[PDB]
């Protein structure tokens, strides 16, 4: 019903995106708006059509891999524990729910509401222990729109923007292409994102895999002479040189380090001390280190 | 290809379940045999079929729900990041993996093979930071038996016996029917797991609720006086009672909390002072505790 395959769920109130509770506490299966990066493996729902309504959908927990249903016949609060999806609506575990867009034509803000009671579901707050728990309240919007979610696409998570992106660094500076000792280097030395010399282009590959082309060049990111990476390769997707290939590790939307495959480092801005190798691209980091942070701008 | 849709790797060798990788290290996304509990939500994998090739398997993970492949054309190291399965045997990236039990008929126990190297993959260690990693190793069996693996259904650790069991508290008794009062109780007082009356039934439902019956009187557990847990119910899958069902919150194979629906409370072993009612099962914890915890044994 226009909802992520899978999915994750944040909440304005208050910045969190939602999660299973797994800590052997009352609230236990219970789903609290409580995890801070949408990298937390609690965090993941999957979303699963209705088989007999149309525009009404079943949610399970990816974890657990148990369907979204209320606690008990007395109570309000969701829990992803359900075996098994029910859609008689007149069942107190009726499992369907009701995507229902706060904005036309928007597809990331949304209200949940739960069919079988008709309320719709808040980042709700009782008292000392049931604090910001998923909970059908009522039939009311929301007044301080605790009813509201943002949706969130997980794979996307794991995609880059193909089209003329470019990297920025933690000085501040974009990566461009610069020439120093007769070698093609990238450099972490532009300040204008219209310098065509910053462009880059991600073709992500089936495999996972990444490799970079460098517009201005037109060649390839390639790990090379002293672990530099020189924009001088030919296609790896026909080649298969693991310098050329690159891994990503990511941190959050378009914020990334890249492992190179032929190293098997990250690749950060680094200043060797050889005259003019200042703030250049090279594999010299094992694991991520703050100059191993790019931040990926699109063009 | 007879293994779970769902699944968690225990390694033969040591102990530990596979898991992806997630920190900011170089080994970031492959695949460590470090988890210690199966609970632990990066330790999931789930089973494709192939389509062309009967008996082969394509494999991912839940978290990233990415395809198993290797590290790049130069490595044998296992990555949890193919975009998509790849079913081209000839090259590097081909996703598929052979199943070879160890044990004819016993689907527990197998060794991996990656088909495109033709090598087992094992719990491999190579010093330093790459320890206990998943390894296409060579096509020779490993006399350490790094090589196998243990198949855990993911499913199958929700689920409990059929048939009768009883519960061990932690005062080392079993659990039996007891008359306080007029009021037939359920006390940690027995050792003979052949007295009738320390037999019960659990009933799992579609909604995650588990309904629990006394075989020798015949009767659900029900919460009523003093919160106390009486065998007296009637079947609440017709009755829809509260307080005769209840949610678990489960630690480990068999040992499992019981929270009460009605009161929201865990059931643990409890002595409330009032002469006669010792060690009997009261919903007298609000998070779990270790009278809290039980263990089921099957009869
Ligand atoms: C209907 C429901 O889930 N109510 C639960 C809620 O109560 C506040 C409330 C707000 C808005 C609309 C309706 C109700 O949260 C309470 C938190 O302690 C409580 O869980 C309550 O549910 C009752 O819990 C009782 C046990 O503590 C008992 O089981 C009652 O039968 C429940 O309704
Ligand atoms: C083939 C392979 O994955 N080799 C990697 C392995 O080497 C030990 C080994 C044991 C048994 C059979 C073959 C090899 O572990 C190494 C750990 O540091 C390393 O990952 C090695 O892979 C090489 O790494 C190089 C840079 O680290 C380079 O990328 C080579 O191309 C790799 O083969």
Redesign the pocket.
Known sequence: AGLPVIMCLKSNNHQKYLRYQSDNIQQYGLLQFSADKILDPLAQFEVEPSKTYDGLVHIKSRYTNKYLVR??P????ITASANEPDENKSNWACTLFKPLYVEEGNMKKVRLLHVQLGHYTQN?T??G??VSYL?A??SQIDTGSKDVFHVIDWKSIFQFPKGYVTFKGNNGKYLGVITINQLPCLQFGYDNLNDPKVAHQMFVTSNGTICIKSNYMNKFWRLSTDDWILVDGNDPRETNEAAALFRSDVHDFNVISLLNMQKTWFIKRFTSGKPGFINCMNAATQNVDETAILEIIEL
């Open positions: 606690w008990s007395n109570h309000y609060w709700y009782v008292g222990s049931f909970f309240e009522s």
